[PDB]
From Swiss-Prot, chain A:
<dbReference type="GO" id="GO:0042802">
    <property type="term" value="F:identical protein binding"/>
</dbReference>
<dbReference type="GO" id="GO:0000150">
    <property type="term" value="F:DNA strand exchange activity"/>
</dbReference>
<dbReference type="GO" id="GO:0070182">
    <property type="term" value="F:DNA polymerase binding"/>
</dbReference>
<feature type="cross-link" description="Glycyl lysine isopeptide (Lys-Gly) (interchain with G-Cter in ubiquitin)">
    <location>
        <position position="38"/>
    </location>
</feature>
<dbReference type="InterPro" id="IPR020587">
    <property type="entry name" value="RecA_monomer-monomer_interface"/>
</dbReference>
<dbReference type="GO" id="GO:0036297">
    <property type="term" value="P:interstrand cross-link repair"/>
</dbReference>
<protein>
    <recommendedName>
        <fullName>DNA repair protein RAD51 homolog 1</fullName>
    </recommendedName>
</protein>
<dbReference type="InterPro" id="IPR011941">
    <property type="entry name" value="DNA_recomb/repair_Rad51"/>
</dbReference>
<dbReference type="GO" id="GO:0000724">
    <property type="term" value="P:double-strand break repair via homologous recombination"/>
</dbReference>
<dbReference type="GO" id="GO:0006310">
    <property type="term" value="P:DNA recombination"/>
</dbReference>
<dbReference type="GO" id="GO:0019899">
    <property type="term" value="F:enzyme binding"/>
</dbReference>
<dbReference type="GO" id="GO:1904631">
    <property type="term" value="P:response to glucoside"/>
</dbReference>
<keyword id="KW-0225">Disease variant</keyword>
<dbReference type="GO" id="GO:0005654">
    <property type="term" value="C:nucleoplasm"/>
</dbReference>
<comment type="function">
    <text>Plays an important role in homologous strand exchange, a key step in DNA repair through homologous recombination (HR). Binds to single-stranded DNA in an ATP-dependent manner to form nucleoprotein filaments which are essential for the homology search and strand exchange. Catalyzes the recognition of homology and strand exchange between homologous DNA partners to form a joint molecule between a processed DNA break and the repair template. Recruited to resolve stalled replication forks during replication stress.</text>
</comment>
<keyword id="KW-0227">DNA damage</keyword>
<dbReference type="GO" id="GO:1990918">
    <property type="term" value="P:double-strand break repair involved in meiotic recombination"/>
</dbReference>
Length: 283, 221, 221
């Protein structure tokens, strides 16, 4: 399991440097320990001596239903909790709709294809609609109000705020059982904020750290981590276990393809976007 | 609620722009932002039962595309006196960001003497790109834009008028300030696609409309 | 709409210059910009039914090309008194950009007492190149031009007169100020090609015209 970074301060790292690591997004001794020097050195207000003291003392301590049956069959039953599943596709393909559907289906019983856990929706693009959650809840006969009560929502204004919300998420996810974390337009803020060409390495470093935090939280809480990418990065490939390509079929019916999985076949499934649901195609 | 004069667009907005709030329409060039502005500049004067605000219009132009003859066409469309429309629309072209904000000081005092219902700022973000083109001066234009938006919101809450600003997509601060975000994209010929991309109250939805000599008006295949 | 006195050009402009707006004619030297200015300086005085504005003309010259005899020729062309034309045209040569802007202060007060219809600034951009020749002073001439344009637009909206400025093409600031941009190029002999290169309302189109002793007048092969 996790080894929360609090224990690192008893090793004699000063508490301000531990706070800087938590701001950076490192929350366990495991997290600080298995990383090279440059990650901690790149953090603001950290010298090489403090990074060596941190690494040295750290080494001392250390299936959610999609609601489309055809899509469930494509995934062999649904998302694996505890791992990152990336769905990359064109705009207007229904990524946000799928997110809204999963935000409710996660609360379904495990026997019904849920995870029996609360949902976390981190929005960066404004497309969050509680009414879609209400529609999905009424579809499966769940209380829409309780669904919204089991979905915590926050809009990230920038990349730093996007990562900063994870600090509140990690502490809040300890008191209650959650099953799904949604980050919608996860890569959009890395394009709008970091728009220059000399600053590309900076956004790549921030994205790398963000993805590592996602994997860490997934392994820590056993929750599903869902991030959305607009294709108008190859780093996510090694990190994401299942890559889904979404493309539009005309009208409201969408084609889904699996484009990498070591376990799932490359295969395709057709589905539709219905007022109640993300739901199988019904010609 | 000021009628857009496109029925499909009125349905998209649930009846039209809410007065007293900022509604931003961001889209590519030639999507019809200016045409919609010209149409609303006249429809605002329409009776409230006809979807207007029964108030005068204010057009602050930054891009040169202002045509009073277009206002005359919209007025004759709705059967309004074109001459009285031009007499009830005060117009001024902002040459830069400082002049754009300075016009608001005259606007606040002038808006007290007569009833207005619509304030239009066309290519509102263009002057912040043409004036402030460097990279070290970005914070200065962002501060100026922030103050301009705050003045707009203050005037909107003070006079209960509709605030319309246009943005060219060749800031995240505007997100919290604008209440309704509309994405405009070209369909070939003269027919344009409108999409709602954020509203806490209005659905994300789309409506098809056309740009006609008389009007901004529903698409008629 | 002030008649250009070329029928084909009037059709190109839909009848002539819109008063109350800036019309820019950019072209090479010797294309006839000055000739067009001299023609309009008289045609403005024509009756509105004849395509004039029934107002006096104002010629601010920066290039020395002002010829009262050309005004007399245009007046006799339209059967207007050449002496009254020169009596209804106030002329002054601007020696520099600062003097060019300073004349507008006298222009604003003088334009209140009598009805004018046309303001001509010939080689309007030449003084910003001859005076401000360095590279560090470019922003200064741009600021001075911006202020000059703002004064022009204010006077145009105040008095409803036509503002004509000439630009030699051997700046993006002029784009926003001019409403209609006309490109002039030479056809050999004395016959010139006119093209519309931007108008939100007028089509991009071309018209052929000639420069005749009496007039700026349609091409007659």
């Amino acid at each position: 399991g996790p080894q929360p970074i609090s224990r690192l301060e008893q090793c004699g790292i000063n508490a301000n440097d531990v706070k800087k690591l938590e701001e950076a997004g490192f929350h366990t001794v495991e997290a600080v320990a298995y990383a090279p020097k440059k990650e901690l050195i790149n953090i603001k207000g950290i010298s090489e001596a403090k990074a060596d003291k941190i690494l040295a003392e750290a080494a001392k301590l250390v299936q959610i239903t999609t609601g489309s049956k055809e899509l469930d069959k494509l995934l062999q039953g649904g998302i694996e909790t505890g791992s990152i599943t990336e769905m990359f596709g064109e705009f207007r393909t229904g990524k946000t709709q799928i997110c809204h559907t999963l935000a409710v289906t996660c609360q379904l019983p495990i026997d019904r294809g849920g995870g029996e856990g609360k949902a976390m929706y981190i929005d960066t693009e404004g497309t969050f609609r509680p009414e879609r959650l209400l529609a999905v809840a009424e579809r499966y006969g769940l209380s829409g109000s309780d669904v919204l009560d089991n979905v915590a929502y926050a809009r990230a204004f920038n990349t730093d705020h996007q990562t900063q919300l994870l600090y509140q998420a990690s502490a809040m996810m300890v008191e209650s059982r959650y099953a799904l974390l949604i980050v919608d337009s996860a890569t959009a803020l890395y394009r709008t904020d970091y728009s220059g060409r000399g600053e590309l390495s900076a956004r790549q470093m921030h994205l790398a750290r963000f993805l590592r935090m996602l994997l860490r939280l997934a392994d820590e809480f056993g929750v599903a981590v869902v991030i959305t990418n607009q294709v108008v990065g190859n780093i996510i490939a090694h990190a994401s276990t299942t890559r889904l390509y979404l493309r539009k079929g005309r009208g409201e019916t969408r084609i889904c393809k699996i484009y990498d999985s070591p376990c799932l076949p490359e295969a395709e499934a057709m589905f539709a976007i219905n007022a109640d649901g993300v739901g199988d195609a019904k010609d």
